[model samples]
Target: FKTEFEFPEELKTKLQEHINYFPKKRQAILLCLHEIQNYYGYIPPESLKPLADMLELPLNHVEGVVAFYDMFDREDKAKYRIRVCVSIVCHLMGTNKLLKALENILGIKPGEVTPDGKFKIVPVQCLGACSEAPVFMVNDDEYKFESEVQLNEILSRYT
Candidate 1:
């Protein structure tokens, strides 16, 4: 393989739990990435090719797998990142108001990170949970809110 990456001594054994189930290691890629995110916050670029080898799959195909899911982040490194859906459905459901409230409280605009590095708020086209309109995700959990008070209440849990 042209690309090389190293894993921590303990992580290899730790990661085996997720890989042990699938007859084809490729089936384990999602679990592997999930576990990687749990430990690393984002998918470290170095690990991608090695992970492809782990799955016995082509590097590009393994790379594409992560793109298919929202759970993986190849770049965003915030300790806490919030993806707010501002699609028509979410807009109709009051995302505009919710966005304004977040700005007032966090003092950062969409796509900007807090100076403290704890949070990054960005607007997305959709989070695919339209039924939970005005939906946003903190890290990986989806949430729904109707008012600034409700949003703040949710924020308190994170802070």
Candidate 2:
């Protein structure tokens, strides 16, 4: 038996009513997923086939869209999606230690969600804040702190 991935009728109606707002039908994909992710924290695995079927595209094509976009999180996520920049500059400024400290404190590795669904730690290539060096963002709030003490203080607010 196949569990349907279609949106709830009311949700589908609301979402469909806005379809004409986008220039391209596919341009609506991100926004659609955004609403899903906003509500559920991540796109459900069962959604792919139904999404492709509704879009009249191959499953591969729909999967490609999800894979290519960094914004689409396939794994489980929580209330605060923590993106820690560990690029060249941030790496040099010591993001590894920061990441480790967080891991130990939260008791979960990167690419993991807390049991209570409060936080998810994910390593990001860059947040484009070289001046801030090692920085992390909780949702949309950016944070640049002074090592362990500050990182602990910052994380407390989110937890």
Candidate 3:
């Protein structure tokens, strides 16, 4: 409790609801972080300790969970932050082509945002589905694409 982060009243209620589903509070970390992300757009570092306290777990454990999950963002991100897997498997599966196509269309490199401030294209490692190589994620959904045409079709849905 030296940490001075405050959870919003509504968010606190939602977090509690998620906590109730698990016998152990630690079991609810993912749901808690998901709700936190849904409410604040990203995981606030300042809130980490408070969340750990709420879960009756160590701060480092919560931090570890946050770091381990690709879906958990540490910074404020664009509305459509695309986490594209560019690991070796994905590379073999045409992630290089995918990255280039995205750059050409968005006019921004990985970790950068579009001029309209709507999208941030980030090149990430394996998204845990090598079978679905060349995969990318938007919000909570995963997608697979083979061409710029598919990319455009996917991008159209976000806006």
Candidate 4:
């Protein structure tokens, strides 16, 4: 029911370029959605109609693709995403300790965002960095062999 959602100027421009490059408008749907997600932090539920309108695709079709993707969030999100690897290798390497450290510093449990809205912590299935085990990703950047001190330093950069 919230109606404040608006696409950023950069995202709109990029999406238009995607549409121009594609032979058919339908082919631009995914790229549009990705750009929207990047700009809005997540793909808001309200975005589907606008996206469909812009891409000239059926609303249902756009919604179907959005719902099928795990990377997309149909809700608001924190500015920074902190993804911790929770695979067996990470678990064995003391990911719980890392999670606890994050919780203590951010004052929120896993899968929760800090009250300040600066950061969010999410547990990921695997990051394919098993050799590093207990790895975590800050946005697109990855950290290996993380310790409390190292994490604190990294978090300080965001806040």
TM-score of each: 0.78, 0.80, 0.78, 0.86
lDDT, each prediction? 0.80, 0.77, 0.85, 0.82
Model 1 per-residue lDDT tens digits across residues 26-117:
78888888877767767887788777777778988977888888657777666777888979999998897878989988888787888887
Can you write out model 4's per-residue Cα lDDT over 90-116, one digit (the tens) per residue? 999989999988887888877787777
| lDDT of each residue in 94-124, candidate 2, tens digit only | 8888888888788887888878988898788
RMSD, every candidate, angstroms: 3.6, 2.7, 3.5, 2.4
Candidate 4 weakest lDDT stretch, 10 residues = 1-10
Model 3: which ten-residue window has the lowest total lDDT?
71-80
Residue pairs in clash, model 3: none
Worst 10 residues of 1 by lDDT: 1-10
Per-residue alpha-carbon lDDT of model 3 for 6-119, expressed as tens digits?
Answer: 998999999998888988888999999988877776788988988998999999999998999977888754777788998888889899888898987888888787767688
Query: Which has the higher TM-score value, candidate number 1 or candidate number 2?
Result: 2
Q: Which stretches of candidate 2 lie over 4 Å from their true place?
A: 1-3, 8-14, 53-56
Itemize residue pairs with steric clashes in candidate 1. none
Worst window of 10 by summed lDDT in candidate 2:
11-20
